[PDB]
Amino acid sequence: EFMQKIGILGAMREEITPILELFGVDFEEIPLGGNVFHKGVYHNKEIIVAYSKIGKVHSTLTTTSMILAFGVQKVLFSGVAGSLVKDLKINDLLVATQLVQHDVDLSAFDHPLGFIPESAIFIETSGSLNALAKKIANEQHIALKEGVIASGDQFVHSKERKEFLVSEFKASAVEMEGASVAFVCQKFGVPCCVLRSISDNADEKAGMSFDEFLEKSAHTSAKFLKSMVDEL
Amino acid sequence: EFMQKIGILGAMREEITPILELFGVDFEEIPLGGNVFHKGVYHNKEIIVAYSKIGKVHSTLTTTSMILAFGVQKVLFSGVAGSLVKDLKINDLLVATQLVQHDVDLSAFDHPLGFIPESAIFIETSGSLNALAKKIANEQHIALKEGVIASGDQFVHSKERKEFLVSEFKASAVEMEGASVAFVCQKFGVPCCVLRSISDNADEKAGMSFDEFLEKSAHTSAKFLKSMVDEL
Numbered sequence: 001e002f003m004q005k006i007g008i009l010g011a012m013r014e015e016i017t018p019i020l021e022l023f024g025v026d027f028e029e030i031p032l033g034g035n036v037f038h039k040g041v042y043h044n045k046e047i048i049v050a051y052s053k054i055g056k057v058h059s060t061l062t063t064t065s066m067i068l069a070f071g072v073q074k075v076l077f078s079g080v081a082g083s084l085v086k087d088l089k090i091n092d093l094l095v096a097t098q099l100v101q102h103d104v105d106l107s108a109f110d111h112p113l114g115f116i117p118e119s120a121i122f123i124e125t126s127g128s129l130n131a132l133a134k135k136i137a138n139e140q141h142i143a144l145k146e147g148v149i150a151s152g153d154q155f156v157h158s159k160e161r162k163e164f165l166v167s168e169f170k171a172s173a174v175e176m177e178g179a180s181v182a183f184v185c186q187k188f189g190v191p192c193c194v195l196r197s198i199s200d201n202a203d204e205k206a207g208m209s210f211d212e213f214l215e216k217s218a219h220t221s222a223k224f225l226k227s228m229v230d231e232l
Numbered sequence: 233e234f235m236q237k238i239g240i241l242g243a244m245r246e247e248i249t250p251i252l253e254l255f256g257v258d259f260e261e262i263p264l265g266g267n268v269f270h271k272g273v274y275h276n277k278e279i280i281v282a283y284s285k286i287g288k289v290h291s292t293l294t295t296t297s298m299i300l301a302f303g304v305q306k307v308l309f310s311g312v313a314g315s316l317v318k319d320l321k322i323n324d325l326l327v328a329t330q331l332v333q334h335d336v337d338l339s340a341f342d343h344p345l346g347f348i349p350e351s352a353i354f355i356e357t358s359g360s361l362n363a364l365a366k367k368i369a370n371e372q373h374i375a376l377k378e379g380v381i382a383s384g385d386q387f388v389h390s391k392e393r394k395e396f397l398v399s400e401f402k403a404s405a406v407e408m409e410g411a412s413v414a415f416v417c418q419k420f421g422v423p424c425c426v427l428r429s430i431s432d433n434a435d436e437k438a439g440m441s442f443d444e445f446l447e448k449s450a451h452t453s454a455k456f457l458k459s460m461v462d463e464l
């Protein structure tokens with residue numbers, strides 16, 4: 001009747017397929033703004049699941065729709081990412097403590113890379129949700145890292161860009177949607193958690209690795225997300 | 233009572249200051265999602281004016297809010313841009329026939345630059361609004377070009393990037409918001425017009441030129457936008 005409403009996002013269909021299957025409930029499909037929102041009831045929560053499509057514009061739009069049109073009270077993102085640090089290996093999980101838009105460049109006006117006037121380089125996520133993930137991971141004896149995630153509108157697959165992301169932002173992983181999702185949530189005062197499982201190492205072999213591990217890594221993230229929702 | 237609702241967007245405050253002044257009516261300030269929406273009544277139309285803040289995430293969010301929360305029926309963007317072609321000089325106006333996100337790169341998977349799965353490289357704008365602009369420009373004896381506008385999250389100020397935009401996309405101008413605004417409008421079936429006045433030539437001197445001409449070029453675009461609204 002007055003159930004908590006939880007938005008759950010992936011970027012690609014492959015990132016939400018395992019989520020829908022794992023919850024195992026019926027969903028109503030609601031189209032809006034070129035996205036399909038799957039609305040169901042799971043453990044006395046209304047869960048709204050969608051894939052945004054790839055990149056920052058897609059993810060910004062879908063997040064905004066989820067908040068303004070569906071009234072979600074928290075947003076959890078689940079999907080895959082490229083690893084930027086040697087201690088994050090294929091299949092490993094992390095939650096973003098902060099996000100950055102790594103491809104923003106207003107250096108022509110002496111702004112630091114990632115910075116836009118009237119905004120900030122780094123976007124924060126929900127301490128409470130991140131602490132819940134840490135609690136669950138320890139109880140399940142699963143490793144879970146915390147760190148900075150870099151988002152941009154390029155698939156990163158070069159040693160040079162990888163090193164830039166580490167040197168400039170101290171990022172632990174790279175993807176194409178988290179910062180936009182967290183940014184929108186922040187603007188609307190909605191708690192946000194960005195969870196990723198490593199699919200590749202963001203180098204010259206990344207396309208290969210991503211193709212090999214998308215399905216498995218997406219499933220690993222999906223399983224963990226469900227375990228979080230179970231305690232919300 | 234049942235007036236047409238028109239959304240009007242700039243990216244920076246400087247792009248909307250002349251718009252608000254030129255309409256010359258009282259506006260109610262309504263904050264939402266970190267933007268301020270100026271709502272007024274002008275010639276029996278409800279006009280909703282806002283600056284998005286710079287770049288693709290900001291502009292996507294503001295456009296989505298304008299449509300979902302304010303119910304606007306058309307969106308007109310007005311502001312400044314860098315020229316990519318010698319026949320577009322400082323202060324000259326153009327309307328975007330199509331827009332592209334010039335910084336999107338999924339070439340690791342052999343996708344063409346600008347392309348994202350389940351989307352398209354080029355986003356269309358409103359033929360009807362573009363034709364209105366052309367009609368007015370001819371009646372006012374003002375030059376008005378039509379062409380492709382490239383949008384990305386970098387201020388472009390190098391000969392190399394400028395040449396890339398021309399060779400890859402046949403773009404006539406560069407900015408940081410038009411494609412995201414047009415993209416959102418398209419997804420919601422809302423007619424969109426992107427109008428820009430040249431502030432710089434998108435080369436190594438662009439920062440200088442932009443600083444010099446922002447105010448004047450913004451005013452030129454604002455004046456033209458008002459002339460369009462007068463005939464809506």
Ligand SMILES: CCCCSC[C@H]1CN(Cc2c[nH]c3c(N)ncnc23)C[C@@H]1O
Pocket residue numbers: 011012053054055080081082154155156157174175176177199200201202203206210338341349
């Ligand atoms: C199907 C063809 C296009 C695939 S583009 C990659 C997907 C997976 N997402 C995360 C992602 C994993 N590895 C990455 C990397 N190396 N760089 C940047 N993002 C990532 C972002 C985007 O939604």
Ligand SMILES: CCCCSC[C@H]1CN(Cc2c[nH]c3c(N)ncnc23)C[C@@H]1O
Pocket residue numbers: 106109117243244285286287312313314386387388389406407408409431432433434435438442
């Ligand atoms: C105040 C410091 C930051 C200014 S960033 C430039 C503004 C003006 N907009 C259009 C614009 C004109 N010239 C351009 C160029 N050469 N490259 C890309 N965009 C442009 C985009 C953005 O909203």
Ligand SMILES: [Cl-]
Pocket residue numbers: 024025026
């Ligand atoms: Cl069910």
Ligand SMILES: [Cl-]
Pocket residue numbers: 256257258
């Ligand atoms: Cl008035």
